[PDB]
Amino acid sequence: SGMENFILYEEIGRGSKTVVYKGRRKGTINFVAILCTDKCKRPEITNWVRLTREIKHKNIVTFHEWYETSNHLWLVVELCTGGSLKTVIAQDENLPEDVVREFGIDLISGLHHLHKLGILFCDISPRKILLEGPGTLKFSNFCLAKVEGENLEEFFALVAAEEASMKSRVKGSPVYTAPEVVRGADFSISSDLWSLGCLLYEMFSGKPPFFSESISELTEKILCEDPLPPIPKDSSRPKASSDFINLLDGLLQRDPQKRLTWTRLLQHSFWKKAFA
Numbered sequence: 001s002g003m004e005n006f007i008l009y010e011e012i013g014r015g016s017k018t019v020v021y022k023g024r025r026k027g028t029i030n031f032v033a034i035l036c037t038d039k040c041k042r043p044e045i046t047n048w049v050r051l052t053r054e055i056k057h058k059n060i061v062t063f064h065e066w067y068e069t070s071n072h073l074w075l076v077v078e079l080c081t082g083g084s085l086k087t088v089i090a091q092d093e094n095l096p097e098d099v100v101r102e103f104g105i106d107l108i109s110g111l112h113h114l115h116k117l118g119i120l121f122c123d124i125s126p127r128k129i130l131l132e133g134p135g136t137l138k139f140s141n142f143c144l145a146k147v148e149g150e151n152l153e154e155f156f157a158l159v160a161a162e163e164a165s166m167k168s169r170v171k172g173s174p175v176y177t178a179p180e181v182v183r184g185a186d187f188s189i190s191s192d193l194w195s196l197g198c199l200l201y202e203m204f205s206g207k208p209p210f211f212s213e214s215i216s217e218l219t220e221k222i223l224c225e226d227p228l229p230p231i232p233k234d235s236s237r238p239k240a241s242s243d244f245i246n247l248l249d250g251l252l253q254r255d256p257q258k259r260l261t262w263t264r265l266l267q268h269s270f271w272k273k274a275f276a
């Protein structure tokens with residue numbers, strides 16, 4: 001029963017109060033990723049499970065099981081041996097536009113599936129995207145995701161109560177936060193599409209469109225700065241196509257009423273009719 005049913009192999013990743021192992025279900029050849037964490041993370045794990053447990057999609061990490069032992073919580077999910085998108089970007093320094101398009105089609109498929117269900121990812125970022133290998137990107141961390149309109153602090157507090165402080169724990173990365181959210185609005189489908197624009201920009205250029213180590217500077221850049229066009233760190237490499245620049249200009253509109261819609265996003269020339 002429970003974790004008795006799994007072989008644990010090497011550690012493949014770590015986080016705060018967290019270790020991820022490669023594992024295998026005993027009596028099978030089914031390999032899994034097993035996240036082992038402190039019980040204080042029950043709100044984050046419960047949220048991840050409740051949002052994804054019934055999702056079966058190629059571009060979203062599959063849920064299998066979660067279990068509790070005397071001193072740990074355990075989450076058993078799909079194994080992705082290709083690492084994070086953050087590592088891919090750091091290695092190549094910059095990705096060719098054809099690769100960005102291929103990866104982008106994966107990101108679109110997964111995000112479209114979530115938004116259809118009313119699920120906001122809220123912290124779209126390279127470290128929360130895993131690769132199957134060679135490609136096949138998957139959204140892979142739902143601690144901070146939520147259903148549209150939900151108060152996630154309230155949800156975290158309710159989980160913690162059964163067993164204001166939560167306003168901090170629900171904070172993801174500020175780098176990809178849409179301007180309207182910086183200004184106090186709640187996350188939305190449109191703010192996720194902004195973050196997608198930041199991610200596509202970073203995949204091609206190797207760096208996010210708006211970045212500062214300082215928080216106050218980053219806030220001002222998101223609200224004032226115009227980032228186009230993305231230029232690879234390797235200045236000798238090909239420049240962005242006019243279709244790709246046009247796509248980013250639509251996604252990185254600061255005014256969400258002017259931002260590219262899903263319907264226009266899927267029809268955009270950059271995808272070369274991938275969604276026709």
Ligand SMILES: c1ccc2c(Nc3cc(C4CCC4)[nH]n3)nc(Nc3ccc4nc[nH]c4c3)nc2c1
Binds near residue numbers: 080
């Ligand atoms: C090389 C190759 C693979 C990985 C890897 N693979 C995974 C991870 C998972 C699930 C465990 C919950 C997602 N499925 N596949 N993960 C990691 N690092 C990591 C570390 C703390 C994490 N907390 C959520 N996700 C995390 C991810 N590094 C890797 C480095």
